[PDB]
Design a protein around this ligand. Structure first.
Ligand SMILES: CCc1c(C#N)c(S[C@@H](C(N)=O)c2ccc(C(F)(F)F)cc2)nc(N2CCC(N)CC2)c1C#N
Ligand SMILES: [Zn+2]
Ligand SMILES: [Zn+2]
Length: 842
DNA sequence: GAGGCCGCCTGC
DNA sequence: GCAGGTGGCCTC
């Protein structure tokens, strides 16, 4: 009934391998594909390739199954082609009696003319099927939701008869993870020294720099205990009646909980303890390092970090011993006064680069000079940027060195003009992107302005951020909203990708793009890319982790053409508040993360509001001078980067909105202490700059939930604070310094935390918005000390724009251009991941 | 033109 | 309950 076809081919102990087996009326050979029924009969069939066939002396006839992954089991879910399978690194030994039948599974490889095969309508992208047998084209990573071209892992001549691609790749991954020593240096009395060791694919040698977690070692600086902020001191509750609403100790935009960046050391020794027989215990690798000081680790403490370069260190003679498994990565730490090039071009020429010029003596608290023993392109992609705005994403890609944006599409004219001023060689289209694509597909060569349209082969990279108006809710699709989606700018952008078939594709959006419409927007987007034959992935990034003093999470979809390497997401560069770094995504109860491994720390300290704008001159509410003096040199590393190399005599766009007299009076009475907002306003009369008056807020109803003040005063300002009573229109009070509407509805809006809120010098910006309004949702827009809202220039700094980047229009147009942009430091980090793929292409 | 006003949903 | 995430549209 089940019988081997022939004789054995290898007797490996208790296993007898065969090349062919006959089951009932069928014959199976290595390489065939088969189905297996699960224990749950309602579940669909399991499908696998047979990689080996053998008899076991105890268990009987066996085979090795290299499982396929059904499309529904991927992030695509039910949007998947019902007959599409995906390769995965999942396999197991199995008895032959579990085999149900033989199946045909074909490999649908992209053609050599794949770049010219695009042009299918949205219905075919969204809902079209291959309409054939079972097939696969892509390999799938279930943890990271990555679709990639199938691996080309070659067999041996030894294991060809039983070769399993999944087994080989799993073995490669396991060995790549375990730390190993390579080249033995010297045999000591108690340890064996080594010249080099490897971990996670990285080579470590004596003298190399290593990243370590902050807990790896301490410094010999006997720290002093900072004066911990006491409990909220009692205030005069009649002068500040709304101060009680600050019972939460949480401060928006505060950096009190951001982790320390990495400890940094230079490898002095790589060693293993010796067993009694003299052999080294190579399963327990240790390293000895010299401790490097960051400026803030010295006695000068945190203020030493204000002016210092973010990659400046101080050599020291202190030493520590840590486990090799604790090393978080490799870095370069060089003596500055021996570099072939200047420090700035060194620091900008590669990742993980640090430098030192002096040494630090903790006992002496002095800075001597270091001892003697401390010393030893690609053509850019032609890019089309859709929904470009003023050009933040293009600017970051340009800094990464990967792109020339030769075409841009921007329908809002002030942003289009801004893009032109910064990109004089680019062609900027103002038409609706559907119109342009229709013209190109009709065979047109120029638009109605005479501008040459991009044709197939011109576009090598496509990037953009499409709005999602009409389907940015969380509720499920219905027939109405699904119609709006297939006619949406998201789908139009995907049609550009299908038509032009660039080498690389990038879609950026608000974080909730991954959750819109029960994640169907994300799932359909990935479905379209797979249907085109693209490798693709998705993830969420926090802009503050790449060098801005701003919390801004963005959803990122990356795609790479067949023949390309699919980029990884960039590792965080700066530590940031952990509350703002929630990057995981749940799709259909399956949790997805990106390849990012820096979860607890990072190489550089967090960028603060101080780093962002401490150098800008004081200006008034309503400041309108477009060109002023800086009044001094840049003070921080961040300011030195954004001001640039060439001296800039003129500071542009340090202008602020002209708030009304009442609002200006409110801002003038928000205290400067961190976390101050409308709840710290005094309840007083104040004469305004226009002769009018601001009135005392009167408490006219009893709020049983909130109680009464210490002097017995009420805390409700309307009858609606009762259970069922409605807002009595006579209870509305006007022109009060404490705005009436905030105590009115504060009980159900978390007390309107942050409204009329001041930024904190040591903290970060909330998400930079298109129109700073102190009483809007993102109300924390007051300057840390000046009685005004943040200026256009300050908002640009919070986005990481260079001071030379030109904006266009009135002040509200400039705020909108800044607030809508992708921060260039985030775009640059993504661009450098793309550059790695350009250089590694086979 | 700008300022007052303020719902619904989700993750924890 | 707390905190984050989406502007819009009333009226002057
Ligand atoms: C916290 C501030 C705020 C905000 C804020 N920020 C918003 S945003 C909201 C709105 N403005 O309608 C919205 C939602 C979705 C879209 C989309 F279509 F684009 F998806 C557009 C606007 N709504 C709010 N309330 C609901 C609408 C009105 N009853 C007034 C109160 C409130 C409030 N209090
Ligand atoms: Zn296997
Ligand atoms: Zn009311």
């Amino acid at each position: 009934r089940i019988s081997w076809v022939g004789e054995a081919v290898k007797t490996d102990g208790k296993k007898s391998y065969y090349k062919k087996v006959c089951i009932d009326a069928e014959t199976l050979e290595v390489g065939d594909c088969v189905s297996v029924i699960p224990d749950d009969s309602s579940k669909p069939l399991y499908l696998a390739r047979v990689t080996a066939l053998w008899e076991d002396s105890s268990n009987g006839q066996m085979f090795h199954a290299h499982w396929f992954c059904a499309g529904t089991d991927t992030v695509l879910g039910a949007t998947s082609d019902p007959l599409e399978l995906f390769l995965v690194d999942e396999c197991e030994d199995m008895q032959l009696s579990y085999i149900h039948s033989k199946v045909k599974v074909i490999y649908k490889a992209p053609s050599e003319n794949w770049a010219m095969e695009g042009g299918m309508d949205p219905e075919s992208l969204l809902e079209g099927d291959d309409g054939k047998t079972y097939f696969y084209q892509l390999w799938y990573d279930q943890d990271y939701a990555r679709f990639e071209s199938p691996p080309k892992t070659q067999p041996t001549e030894d294991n060809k008869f039983k070769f399993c691609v999944s087994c080989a790749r799993l073995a490669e991954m396991r060995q790549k993870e375990i730390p190993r020593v390579l080249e033995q240096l010297e045999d000591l009395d108690s340890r064996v020294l080594y010249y080099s060791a490897t971990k996670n694919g990285i080579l470590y040698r004596v003298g190399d720099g290593v990243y370590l977690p902050p807990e790896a070692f301490t410094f010999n600086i006997k720290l002093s205990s900072p004066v911990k902020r006491p409990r909220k001191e009692p205030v005069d509750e009649d002068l500040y009646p709304e101060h009680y609403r600050k019972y939460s100790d949480y401060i928006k935009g505060s950096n009190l909980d951001a982790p320390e960046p990495y400890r940094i050391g230079r490898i002095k020794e790589i060693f293993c303890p010796k067993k009694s027989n003299g052999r080294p215990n190579e399963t327990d690798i240790k390293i000895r390092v010299n401790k490097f000081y960051r400026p803030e680790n010295t006695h000068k403490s945190t203020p030493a970090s204000y002016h210092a370069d973010i990659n400046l260190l101080y050599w020291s003679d202190e030493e520590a011993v840590v486990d090799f498994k604790a090393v978080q990565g490799r870095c370069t730490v060089e003596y500055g006064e021996d570099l072939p090039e200047c420090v700035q071009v060194y620091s900008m020429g590669g990742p993980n680069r640090f430098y030192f010029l002096e040494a630090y003596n903790a006992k002496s608290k002095s800075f001597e000079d270091p001892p003697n023993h401390a010393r030893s392109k690609l053509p850019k992609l032609r890019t089309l940027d859709v929904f470009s705005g003023c050009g933040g994403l293009s600017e970051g890609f340009h800094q990464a060195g990967i792109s020339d944006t030769l075409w841009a599409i921007e329908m809002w004219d002030p942003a289009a003009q801004a893009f032109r001023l910064n990109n004089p060689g680019s062609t900027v289209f103002t038409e609706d992107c559907n119109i342009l694509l229709k013209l190109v597909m009709a065979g047109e060569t120029t638009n109605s302005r005479g501008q040459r349209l991009p044709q197939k082969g011109d576009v090598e990279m496509l990037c953009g951020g499409p709005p999602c108006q009409g389907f940015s809710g969380m509720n499920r699709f219905n027939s109405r909203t699904y119609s709006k989606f297939k006619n949406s700018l998201v789908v139009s952008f995907l049609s550009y990708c299908d038509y032009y078939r660039p080498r690389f594709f990038l879609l950026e959006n608000v974080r909730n793009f991954v959750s819109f419409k029960r994640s169907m927007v994300l799932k359909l987007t990935l479905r379209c890319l797979v249907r085109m034959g693209y490798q693709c992935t998705f993830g969420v990034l926090q802009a503050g982790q790449y060098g801005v003093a701003q919390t801004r999470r963005r959803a990122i979809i990356l795609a790479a053409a067949p023949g390309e390497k699919l980029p990884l997401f960039p590792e965080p560069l700066h530590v940031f508040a952990p509350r703002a770094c929630q990057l995981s995504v749940v799709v259909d109860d399956k949790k997805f993360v990106s390849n990012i491994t820096r979860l607890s720390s990072g190489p550089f300290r967090t960028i603060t509001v101080r780093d962002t704008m401490s150098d800008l001159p004081e200006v008034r509410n309503g400041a309108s001078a477009l060109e002023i003096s800086y009044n001094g040199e840049p003070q921080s590393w961040f300011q030195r980067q954004l001001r640039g190399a060439q001296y800039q005599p003129i500071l542009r766009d340090h202008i602020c909105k002209d708030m009304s007299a009442l609002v200006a009076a409110r801002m003038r009475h928000i205290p400067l202490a961190p976390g101050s907002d409308w709840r710290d306003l005094p309840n007083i009369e104040v004469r305004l700059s226009d002769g009018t008056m601001a009135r005392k807020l009167r408490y006219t109803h009893h709020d049983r939930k909130n109680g009464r003040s210490s002097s017995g005063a009420l805390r409700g300002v309307c009858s609606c604070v009762e259970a069922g009573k409605a807002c009595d229109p006579a209870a509305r009070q006007f022109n009060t310094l404490i705005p009436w509407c905030l105590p009115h509805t504060g009980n159900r809006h978390n007390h309107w935390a942050g409204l009329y809120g001041r930024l904190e010098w040591d903290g970060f910006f909330s998400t930079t918005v298109t129109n700073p309004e102190p009483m809007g949702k993102q109300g924390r827009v007051l300057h840390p000390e000046q009685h005004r809202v943040v200026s256009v220039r300050e908002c640009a700094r919070s986005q990481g724009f260079p001071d030379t980047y030109r904006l266009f229009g009135n002040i509200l147009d400039k705020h909108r251009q800044v607030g809508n942009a992708v921060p260039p430091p985030l775009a640059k980090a993504i661009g450098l991941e793309i550059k790695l793929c350009m250089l590694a292409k086979a």
